[PDB]
């Protein structure tokens, strides 16, 4: 297995200036002819010319129109085409080839493949080499002239990057289109699409240059009525980049295309963004509410790459976070502005501190800029994306909006049209830092440790108040646990956004303040503090760290009720829950270990329950925030705090805590469920796809959260509410009715009803599958077998496979059945999927990421399944590398 090392970067001995492609799609094969106009670089030392080319069937290869012969002048081993240096010219030359590829049977969905009746490419990271020979790395920038030909009846719409400069008829019912894209680009941004596509379109006029941009959104004909929201999101994305960043789109046209089979969410190919249908298509009758934020996020994300990734690209793949972390940060700013709901930021933090913190304490832990890789298909991680986004966001917190915008414009202006590295971005931020500090000696050298140091820092506090001196001090310490990447961890530049709350009136005691912690510890002192405050720490979640606030539950309750910052309120609630969970977990664990016949559990704090009631009953409080406070922290968040976690004991712990709170608040929950109905389920705009109300969707989230709590509690006659909910026009409601009916004898009646409502829309059916998969059913294993035999079958669609299996893996009690049968089931699915899609097989390994954090019996059971998968003779490179790292081999 070849390991690539970040420190080994060296420019190529060759240059590719022009790519001229002819892609001829036929029924049983696709023929690709390519001429590369090439040159010798200043770094050349007379080496062999080696092209990447994976799984290509050679018809011919030539240099300057002289056909080369295998064995004598070149070798090809299905991965590398080597032309021996004695046959490589010393000045500008043309390399040409004709190869045969087979998109129909390309079920790995990389390179050129068929998704239903659409031919589509996916070239990031190293997929272009599956289409034709290339030096397949992002610093090999070239011009592209691309012709596609195909049967006209089957493939009337032909698309590639750049301007469509010719369309022509071909004998035999064929036709072609030629696309010329003069600006230099890396090959991972090449794309082609051919299909019987239908569209919606609009014209957007840029803010400053007043350029007309044509916007097109495409899908198969069946789903063309689901394209409206995506088009609105694209217009919103363009306006946001103009308004916040002053950045306009540079091209005459932007196409977005939905396909049914896609490994991830979407891809930013220049002028031709390609999407998983689940991240582009929605309608109010056929989609759950989550689709609306998802489409907004993903359309925005791909659009923002036009600058951060496309116009400014990567020198090499180790710089991935420079485009992905920065584009996620841009998407987060956009979505926060578009939704105007505090839950947008909270949802990103909730994901980071569960999924990403788990990764960062697992054997897979890596910094946002890794030092090495084997599989690029395994590099696209929540660490690179989501911790990367938080590292990119910390620059905005440190600089403030005005100087952040100044620094970002420096980055764009200096690097536009070129490759870049993480250091280029830090340099631009540093220039703004010097301006803000009015000190040309200020620097951000320490900040670079956020790119190289793995693991989550822990930040802890101690406080002191002198009533006579009116002087308050916050003593802060940071620590990162040593791991496989650094034996000694260095202190980071940690910005701590803080407020000081007066506990008597709830008011702010100081102005906006961001503490800059740059040492292992520091003491921050505040004078003229008239009363002992309660500190509001890491406002907005100002650094990606474990926060140890050292506050009492009384202090946390005061913040939960009265603080101004949504995150600190949410975090104070989280911390109250965590203290309770850890205490009850240990009480249950001791009773299990000691086989006690009787024992005591510490009750939930009654003032905390009163505080939840107070917030729930406040009509001016936010419905989305309310849904968070009645929900315990995610299992994957909890697990970072418990060694040898017994999942059954955790399930009993959560059940006790939910029952304690419900025993006091269920009548409140029911009253709110009923009173929220009118606004939550308002149908005024049901047939307007342009009208999306994020507050209303949060009201539905709150109702559906309360309904779940009341259903689990067997609240009297709640089944009546469940049945009525199943008649709602909103899929979020009627699918909720299925999941909450799991606790009643009506489950299979609702299973059949909602199946019939879902079966005729491909994406809705996938949402139905997820709802079944995560249903809290004692017979879930039998239900999964039924889904396999009746619905999923041998589908190779990643959306189908992920929908059936991933939600079930979050069933704490059932997936972690002590027999190991859930681990065995998912391992069988992984091995089956690995035969045709290694990238998706590795995604399906997700539940194993926490294996070494569980109790010793479950550790053994998971390790046995991972070792079984590793022993499969036909294991893919992707899956083998991933499991070897995960099991510490
Ligand atoms: O969709 C997303 N991410 C995209 C993305 O960054 N889009 O900008 C993304 C991820 C992995 C690949 C990728 C890599 C490979 F190595 C492959 F082989 C391959 F097939 C595909 C391609 C695109 C989520 C949702 C929005 C942002 C996070
Ligand atoms: Mg092949
Ligand atoms: Mg405008
Ligand atoms: Mg299908
Ligand atoms: Mg290891
Ligand atoms: Zn991206």
PDB file of N, CA and C and ligand atoms in Angstrom, residues 55-57 100-102, ligand 2:
ATOM      1  N   UNK A  55      -8.175   1.080 -14.692  1.00  0.00           N
ATOM      2  CA  UNK A  55      -9.219   0.301 -15.322  1.00  0.00           C
ATOM      3  C   UNK A  55      -9.534   0.698 -16.743  1.00  0.00           C
ATOM      4  N   UNK A  56      -8.574   1.279 -17.454  1.00  0.00           N
ATOM      5  CA  UNK A  56      -8.796   1.689 -18.832  1.00  0.00           C
ATOM      6  C   UNK A  56      -8.395   0.554 -19.765  1.00  0.00           C
ATOM      7  N   UNK A  57      -9.159   0.364 -20.836  1.00  0.00           N
ATOM      8  CA  UNK A  57      -8.783  -0.568 -21.893  1.00  0.00           C
ATOM      9  C   UNK A  57      -8.182   0.237 -23.038  1.00  0.00           C
ATOM     10  N   UNK A 100     -11.346   2.532 -23.770  1.00  0.00           N
ATOM     11  CA  UNK A 100     -12.722   2.084 -23.599  1.00  0.00           C
ATOM     12  C   UNK A 100     -12.997   1.940 -22.108  1.00  0.00           C
ATOM     13  N   UNK A 101     -14.120   2.510 -21.659  1.00  0.00           N
ATOM     14  CA  UNK A 101     -14.604   2.395 -20.290  1.00  0.00           C
ATOM     15  C   UNK A 101     -16.066   1.954 -20.346  1.00  0.00           C
ATOM     16  N   UNK A 102     -16.628   1.608 -19.186  1.00  0.00           N
ATOM     17  CA  UNK A 102     -17.933   0.939 -19.131  1.00  0.00           C
ATOM     18  C   UNK A 102     -18.801   1.519 -18.025  1.00  0.00           C
TER      19      UNK A 102
HETATM   20 MG1  LIG B   2     -12.306  -0.696 -17.221  1.00  0.00          MG
END
